[PDB]
C-alpha cells in the first residue's frame, strides 16, 4: 500500500553514501541496516580508544553514540556500551575485530565474576575459545550495561593458563602428572606434620562457592580453623560477622535503588567499585531530588556529591546533623558500605556508628524497605559469609602455619606466609599467588565450570558451562575430593549434585537458582543488634584475568 513507500523511502535514504563494506564489516552479519533494508526496503538501485574501532564512514547517525554518553555513563568506565548500542557497524569492538562471524558463534547465558554484582551476560564462544562477551538483559541487576573491565578481559583466559600440575624442584616449577602432584602434597604433608593451627587455607576473589564449602570439610577432617579470604580485615573475625545474612548483604537489592532519597557512601568509589550501579545512581541523580554525601577518601566521579571530607570523624557529625536529618526525613533512605571498610583500621567503628542510626529510627526499616546495605567487590566474600568460611579468633590468625593451601588466593602479600610452610596453590592462572606455591593444581575458568556464585545482594546465580577446561585441568572442587583420598579425609560427595546436596545442609537459599531469600523484618532487626582510603588502586589490575589480559595492557 501507500505506507510501504515510507519504508522504501527511509531505506533508500540511509543507503545513499553508505560504504559497501558488508564483507569487511566487523559485525556485518547482524547489523540492523541489512536485516531492515531487506524486510522493509526495496531490492534494486579518527579514533576514540584502544577499545572501540571507530569508523564513522559506516554511520547512519542518530547520535546514539552521543545520547548515551551524556545520559548513563558520563576515560569512561562504560564507554564500551556504545559498541552494543550502535546498530550499524559504525562503532565496532577493536579486540574482537576481524575474528568471528555471528552466524558461527555459540551463545551461553552466564554471569560475570569480576565484581560482586554478578550481572547476567551472554558469552559467544567458538569451539574451545571464548570470542566476545555481551550483556543479556536483566532489569533486576544490570539492564544492558557491563563495564569495560568485564567485556575486555575475555582474552585473559587465553594466556598464562595453568594447564598441568606443577611441582617445584629447586626454584622452578616442572611438569608433573596428577598422580605425583596429589602425592607430593601428601608426601610432604607428613614430613612437617602440621598441628591444629599449623594448617591454613586462603580463598581467592574468584573462587566459587562449591570449592569454598568443600574445602572446609577437607580442612575440618584434618583439624584446622585458619580459613578466610585474601582480604586485609584488621579485625580477625569480620566486623559485620558471618552470623546473620543482613550483616553483609544488599537487603534492598539492586531493584530498590531508583526509589531512594538519601544515599551514604561509606568510604567507596562507586565509579571504580561497581560501574553498572554507578550509572544507576547517575540516572536517578538527573531527574530525581537525589542527595548523596561523600564520606571517605576523595575521588573523581561522573556526578558531584554532597562532599564532606576524608576522615571517619566526618561521619561522626553526619547522622546527628542535617546530613542525617534528611536520612530521617527520607521515606526510603539508603546506606551503602563498600568493600573498603573492613580493610580500614576503623572498620569496627563503622558498624557501631551506623547501626545505632538504624536501631534508632523506624522509617529506615519498614516491612518494604531496609535502609542499610553492603557493597562488596569480590564474588567469593558473600559466598564465604553465607557458609561461615571465616575465622573467629585473632590467636588463630597469628599462628605461623606450616601448611598453607591456597585456593584461588592472590592478594596475600600482607598475609604472613611462613617461608618454611608448605604452600599449595590451586587455580587457573599464573600470577602473584602462583609464585608462592610448591605444588600447583590447575583449576577452571569461570566460563568452563558450573559454579554457583552469590552476588553482593544475596542473589544465588550459577553458571552454565561454555567450554572444557584447558589442558588437563579439572573442576575446582573435584581436586579437593581427589586430594581428600590422599590424606585420609575422603568426602562423601561423588557428583556435582551431591556438592549441591551438601549446600542444602549449609542453607536453603544456596539451592534456589536466580532466587533471593531475604532477611525477614522480624529478624533482620535482631541482626542489627549484633553491631550494637579507596580499596582499589588500579582499575584495570583488580582480578586475576585482568592482570593476565593482553587487552588491558592497552588500558595502561
Amino acid at each position: 500500500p501507500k505506507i510501504k513507500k515510507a519504508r522504501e523511502g527511509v531505506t533508500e535514504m540511509l543507503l545513499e553514501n553508505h560504504p559497501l563494506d558488508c564483507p569487511v564489516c566487523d559485525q556485518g552479519g547482524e547489523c540492523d541496516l541489512q536485516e531492515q533494508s531487506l524486510r522493509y526496503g526495496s531490492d534494486r538501485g579518527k579514533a576514540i580508544g584502544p577499545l572501540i574501532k571507530t569508523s564513522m564512514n559506516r554511520c547512519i547517525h542518530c547520535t546514539r553514540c552521543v545520547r548515551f554518553l551524556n545520559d548513563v555513563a558520563g576515560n569512561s568506565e562504560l564507554s564500551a556500551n556504545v559498541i552494543d548500542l550502535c546498530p550499524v557497524g559504525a562503532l565496532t569492538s577493536k579486540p574482537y575485530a576481524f575474528r568471528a562471524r555471528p552466524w558461527e558463534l555459540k551463545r551461553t547465558e552466564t554471569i560475570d565474576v569480576h565484581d560482586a554484582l554478578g550481572s547476567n551476560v551472554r558469552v559467544d564462544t567458538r569451539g574451545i575459545e571464548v570470542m566476545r562477551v555481551l550483556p543479556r538483559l536483566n532489569d533486576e541487576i544490570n539492564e544492558e550495561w557491563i563495564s569495560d573491565k568485564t567485556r575486555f578481559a575475555c582474552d585473559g583466559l587465553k594466556t598464562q593458563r595453568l594447564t598441568k600440575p606443577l611441582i617445584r624442584q629447586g626454584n622452578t616449577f616442572v611438569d608433573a602428572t596428577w598422580e605425583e602432584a596429589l602425592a607430593t602434597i601428601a608426601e610432604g604433608f607428613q614430613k612437617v606434620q602440621p598441628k591444629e593451627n599449623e594448617i591454613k587455607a586462603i580463598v581467592g576473589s574468584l573462587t566459587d562457592l562449591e570449592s569454598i564449602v568443600a574445602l572446609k570439610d577437607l580442612v575440618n577432617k584434618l583439624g584446622s580453623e585458619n580459613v578466610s579470604t585474601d582480604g586485609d580485615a584488621t579485625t580477625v573475625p569480620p566486623a559485620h560477622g558471618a552470623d546473620f545474612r543482613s550483616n553483609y548483604i544488599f537487603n534492598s537489592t539492586i531493584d530498590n535503588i531508583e526509589e531512594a532519597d538519601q544515599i551514604l557512601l561509606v568510604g567507596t568509589n562507586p565509579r571504580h567499585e561497581a560501574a553498572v550501579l554507578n550509572a544507576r545512581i547517575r540516572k536517578v541523580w538527573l531527574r530525581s531530588d537525589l542527595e548523596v554525601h561523600h564520606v571517605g577518601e576523595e575521588f573523581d566521579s561522573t556526578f558531584e556529591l554532597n562532599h564532606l571530607g576524608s576522615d571517619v570523624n566526618a561521619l561522626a557529625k553526619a547522622l546527628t546533623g542535617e546530613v542525617g536529618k534528611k536520612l530521617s526525613e527520607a521515606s526510603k533512605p539508603l546506606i551503602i558500605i563498600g568493600s573498603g571498610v573492613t580493610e580500614t583500621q576503623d572498620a569496627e567503628a563503622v558498624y557501631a556508628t551506623v547501626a545505632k542510626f538504624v536501631t534508632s529510627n523506624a522509617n529506615i526499616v519498614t516491612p518494604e524497605w531496609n535502609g542499610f546495605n553492603l557493597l562488596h567487590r569480590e564474588a567469593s566474600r558473600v559466598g564465604a559469609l553465607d557458609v561461615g568460611f571465616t575465622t573467629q579468633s585473632p590467636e588463630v590468625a597469628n599462628t605461623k602455619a606450616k601448611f598453607i593451601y591456597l585456593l584461588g588466593a592472590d592478594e596475600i602479600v600482607n598475609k604472613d606466609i611462613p617461608k618454611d610452610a608448605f604452600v599449595v596453590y590451586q587455580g587457573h592462572h599464573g600470577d602473584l599467588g602462583a609464585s608462592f606455591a610448591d605444588v600447583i593444581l590447575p583449576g577452571s575458568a569461570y566460563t568452563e565450570k558450573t559454579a554457583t556464585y552469590v552476588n553482593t545482594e544475596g542473589r544465588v546465580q550459577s553458571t552454565r558451562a561454555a567450554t572444557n577446561p584447558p589442558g588437563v585441568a579439572r573442576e575446582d572442587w573435584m581436586i579437593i575430593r581427589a586430594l581428600s583420598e590422599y590424606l585420609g579425609a575422603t568426602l562423601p560427595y561423588d557428583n556435582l549434585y551431591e556438592m549441591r546436596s551438601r549446600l542444602a545442609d549449609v542453607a536453603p537459599h544456596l539451592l534456589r537458582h536466580e532466587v533471593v531469600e531475604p532477611v525477614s523484618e522480624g529478624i533482620a532487626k535482631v541482626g542489627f543488634q549484633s553491631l550494637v582510603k579507596n580499596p582499589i588502586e588500579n582499575f584495570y589490575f583488580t582480578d586475576v584475568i585482568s592482570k593476565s589480559s593482553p587487552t588491558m595492557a592497552k588500558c595502561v
Binding site: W178, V472, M478, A482
Partner: protein
C-alpha cells in the same frame, strides 16, 4: 504379492492375557533354532551358550507393564526373530551382538578424565 518366510500381521493386541501366551511361544521359537544360529552364522559359541545368551535376553526385560508398549516390544522382537531366522543379518553383526561387554572409584575417574 506374497509375504516372506516367518511373517506375521502387525496387530494391536487388546488383551493382557493373550500377549502373555504369544511371548511364551516366541521364546521357545528362539530355543528351537539354537542349533541353526550356530551353524548358520558360524558362531564361536556352542549351542548351550546361545540359549544362555537368549535366556539372558529374555530374562532381562520381562517386567514391563504398559500394554501399548507391550505390543511394540513384541512387534520389534518379532522382526529380530524374522531377520535372524531368515539369515538376513551379516555374520559380523551376530558375532558382535554377543561380544558386547564393574565401575571404578572417583580417584580413578578423576585422574584419567572421567566422562
Amino acid at each position: 504379492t506374497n509375504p516372506t518366510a516367518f511373517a506375521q500381521t502387525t496387530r494391536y493386541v487388546k488383551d493382557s492375557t493373550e500377549m502373555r501366551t504369544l511371548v511364551l511361544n516366541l521364546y521357545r521359537r528362539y530355543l528351537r533354532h539354537s542349533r541353526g544360529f550356530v551353524n548358520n552364522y558360524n558362531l564361536d559359541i556352542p549351542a548351550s551358550q546361545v540359549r544362555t545368551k537368549i535366556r539372558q535376553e529374555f530374562e532381562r526385560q520381562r517386567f514391563v507393564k504398559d500394554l501399548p508398549l507391550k505390543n511394540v516390544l513384541y512387534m520389534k522382537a518379532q522382526m529380530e526373530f524374522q531377520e535372524l531366522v531368515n539369515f538376513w543379518k551379516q555374520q559380523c553383526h551376530v558375532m558382535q551382538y554377543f561380544e558386547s561387554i564393574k565401575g571404578d572409584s572417583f580417584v580413578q575417574k578423576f585422574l584419567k578424565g572421567a566422562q
